């Protein structure tokens, strides 16, 4: 029949081209090296290496939310990051309240450093809450713009009455006393009730005191009394919508009420912060497990061979062959007109194990079993004649399944199989040329060888952008309490509004309660 005739024809062709393959040791490997780059490398610059912008600055001169789907394809030279597309989760307004006292005297206690500034916090919060536009075209008051929140997560019963709920999300030190100035005045341990929920050890999540103060802990510690400083906090406003007129009016009203001398804050740009999806170690264990499985598989594919000259050479060559084949294929997928957007990181080991090494491995056995001792073209000829139709059937069997695999409707499986077919064909070509040339040169070489002023309020460029000195889990912790996610979205941070308070030391003496010199709280490890 035709089967034996076809076998004879293909064996004759294999024998004929084996001599040609062995005839050019250097030219063929040079061709392979040139083609490996030429086919795929120039377009490998286009994919993103992985780094990208996480903070985006937008001028406050004219701001509008970015379009969500105005363009089917985003412009190439556009500066807007891929996440800066939709509306932000919320706009965060910080009101940094620094303060100072008239000439310091010895009668002031440590509790005064907390009592004097926090006393005005309730009045400031009341002014912010009751502020309204007397002449407006759009919004009028804080109610129409504030991000309303209903209730906290279940299991956070301990934080009830210490965080806002059923109202606008407004954070201030007055939340410790529920914005009740009478309660704050009657409280006999201000530092104690401030540090009531302070953890005894370091915690990744943001502390309740840190959340309510909105300030890094170095500006609000008890140790400031030694340096004659004063506690500074921040009233945090969370905005569901943006209204330039209302924000400007609020800033102007605060500046009128509490003017801040020698203040030159720029208030020029918004800041957009995008939070990525944090991947835990739970999703990582299968990844490293399959990587080590791949390493074990390649190690077991090797170590089953014996070389006339080397002991690891052609094994390394086969590993390089498969790696370069897959690297060529992942790039040529773009030229094929198919989407290369697959993750790849977890695809790589399964792709390698699917490609396999049987075809390359079986080629070496007959070649090293060739009885010719001197001639190299001979050894190539008999070894390749022996291996004829064998690698062909192995490759055909390994590739036939992939067509049925991608004949289904699954998109990810289809992409995997489209990668696999081109990887297998590139592997076939590369083992047909580079591996046979390197084993030919190995065979060739084998036979050849054988006084004491209180510091004044300053508004330098460090007070601005103070949010970036907070804990990296500050904002996600705050929003998670209200069942709001930032995993796929971003937030916008408005410039801080400075507020400066002048305080009278005689006020602390007049309001000096008994037993003010003692408190249960004590700074741990400091």
């Amino acid at each position, epitope marked *: 029949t035709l089967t034996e005739r076809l076998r004879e024809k293909i064996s004759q062709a294999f024998y004929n081209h084996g001599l040609l393959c062995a005839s050019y040791p250097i030219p063929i490997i040079l061709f392979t090296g040139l083609c490996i780059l030429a086919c795929c490398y120039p377009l490998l610059k286009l994919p993103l290496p992985g780094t990208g912008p996480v903070e985006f600055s937008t001028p406050v001169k004219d701001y509008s939310p970015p379009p969500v789907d105005s363009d089917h394809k985003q412009g190439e030279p556009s500066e807007q990051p891929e996440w800066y597309v939709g509306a932000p989760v919320a706009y965060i307004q910080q009101i940094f309240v620094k303060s100072s006292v008239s000439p310091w005297h010895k009668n002031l206690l440590a509790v005064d450093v907390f009592r004097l500034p926090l006393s005005r916090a309730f009045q400031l919060v009341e002014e912010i809450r009751n502020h309204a*536009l*007397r*002449d407006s*075209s*759009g919004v009028k008051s804080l109610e129409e713009v504030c991000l309303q929140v209903t209730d906290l997560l279940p299991g956070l019963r301990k934080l009830r009455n210490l965080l806002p709920e059923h109202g606008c999300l407004l954070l201030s030190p007055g939340n410790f006393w529920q914005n009740d100035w009478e309660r704050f005045h009657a409280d006999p341990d201000i530092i104690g009730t401030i540090h009531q929920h302070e953890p005894k050890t370091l915690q990744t999540s943001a502390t309740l005191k840190d959340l309510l103060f909105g300030v890094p802990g170095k500006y609000s510690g008890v140790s400031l009394y030694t340096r004659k400083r004063t506690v500074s906090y921040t009233i945090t406003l969370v905005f569901q919508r943006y209204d330039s*007129r209302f924000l*400007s*009016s609020l800033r*102007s*009203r605060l500046k*009128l009420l509490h003017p801040s001398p020698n203040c030159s804050l720029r208030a020029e740009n918004l800041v957009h912060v995008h939070f990525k999806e944090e991947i835990g170690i739970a999703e990582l264990i299968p990844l490293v497990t399959t990587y080590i499985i791949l390493f074990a598989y390649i190690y077991f594919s090797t170590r089953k061979i014996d070389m006339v000259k080397s002991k690891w050479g052609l094994a390394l060559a086969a590993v390089v062959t498969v790696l370069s084949s897959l690297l060529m294929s992942v790039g040529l997928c773009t030229l094929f007109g198919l989407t290369p957007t697959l993750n790849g990181g977890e695809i790589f080991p399964y792709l390698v194990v699917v490609i396999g090494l049987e075809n390359v491995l079986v080629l070496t056995k007959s070649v090293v079993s060739t009885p010719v001792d001197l001639e190299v073209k001979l050894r190539i000829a008999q070894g390749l004649s022996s291996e004829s139709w064998s690698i062909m059937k192995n490759v055909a069997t390994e590739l036939g399944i992939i067509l049925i695999g991608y004949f289904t409707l699954v998109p990810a499986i289809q992409e995997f199989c489209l990668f696999a077919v081109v990887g297998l064909v590139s592997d076939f070509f590369l083992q047909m040329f580079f591996f046979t040339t390197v084993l030919s040169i190995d065979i060739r070489r084998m036979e050849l060888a054988d006084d004491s002023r209180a510091p004044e309020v300053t508004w330098g460029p460090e007070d601005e952008e103070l949010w970036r000195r907070l804990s990296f889990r500050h904002w996600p912790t705050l929003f998670n309490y209200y069942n709001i996610t930032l995993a796929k979205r971003y937030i916008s941070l408005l410039p801080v509004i400075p507020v400066t308070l002048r305080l009278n030391p005689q006020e602390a003496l007049e309001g000096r309660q008994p037993q003010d010199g003692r408190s249960a709280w004590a700074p741990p490890e400091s």
Partner: antibody, heavy 120, light 108 residues
Framework: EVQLQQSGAELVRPGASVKLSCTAS????????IHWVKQRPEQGLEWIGRIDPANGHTRYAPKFQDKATITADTSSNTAYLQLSSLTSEDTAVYYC?????????????WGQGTTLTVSS | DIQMTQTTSSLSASLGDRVTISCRAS??????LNWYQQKPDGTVKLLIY???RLHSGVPSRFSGSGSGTDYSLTISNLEQEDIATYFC?????????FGGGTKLEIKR
């Protein structure tokens, strides 16, 4: 640097309508509101109304709710005040004004004022 | 609805003297009172806003004070260029109302 140039003096028989104009130089009218103030020789200054050019929202005093209408055009950077059914009580100087701060609400920059006279 | 009243329609004063101008609001306006100076040429300029804040470019010669319903404007030394008429405007209730205005002059 910031100027609000106004039109010339006007003389119109009673019963007609007058459309005074205000051109802003040095800034874009989208940023701030535009106001119109009427000053009779002895009755003192009076507030007519204002318009938000970026939105078109207008508000007037109860006296001028029906007498006066205020419109603006962002492209030409001008604002217009129109008086309907002119009567002898309308002989006054009209000032075009904006404000910068949105809590103090102070009329920082004023126009030169256009004298308007109505008579037979 | 709020009416501002300047009882002293004319306030004769000499050059180099300190001059005070006061207007009374019908009700409390919460320190929202601005002062405007209108030259005889007809131009109008803003002197003081909120209740005592000096506008940009206004000389420190002008100052203001007051609270509740009583407010005042003071001139350190009356200059020739300061001979004009002054109005006080309230910005507490939306229909902004101006004062009756007072005119300065030199003694004869």
């Amino acid at each position: 640097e910031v100027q609000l140039q106004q039109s010339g003096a006007e003389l119109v028989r009673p019963g007609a309508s007058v459309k005074l104009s205000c051109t802003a130089s040095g800034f874009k009218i989208k940023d701030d509101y535009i106001h119109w103030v009427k000053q009779r020789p002895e009755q003192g200054l009076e507030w007519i109304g204002r318009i938000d050019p970026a939105n078109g929202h207008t508000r007037y005093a109860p006296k001028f709710q029906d007498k006066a209408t205020i419109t603006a055009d962002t492209s030409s950077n001008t604002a217009y005040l129109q008086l309907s059914s002119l009567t002898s009580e309308d002989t006054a100087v009209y000032y075009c004004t904006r404000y910068n701060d949105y809590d103090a609400f102070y009329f920082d920059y004023w126009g030169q004022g256009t004298t308007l006279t109505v008579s037979s | 609805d709020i009416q501002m009243t300047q009882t002293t329609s004319s306030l004769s004063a000499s050059l180099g003297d300190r001059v005070t101008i006061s207007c009374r609001a019908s009700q409390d306006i919460r320190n929202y009172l601005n002062w405007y100076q209108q030259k005889p040429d007809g131009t109008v300029k803003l002197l003081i806003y909120y209740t005592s804040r000096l506008h940009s470019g206004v000389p420190s010669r002008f100052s203001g004070s007051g609270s509740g319903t009583d407010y005042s404007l003071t001139i350190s030394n009356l200059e020739q260029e300061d001979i004009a008429t002054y109005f006080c405007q309230q910005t507490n209730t939306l229909p902004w109302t101006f004062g009756g205005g007072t005119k300065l002059e030199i003694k004869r």
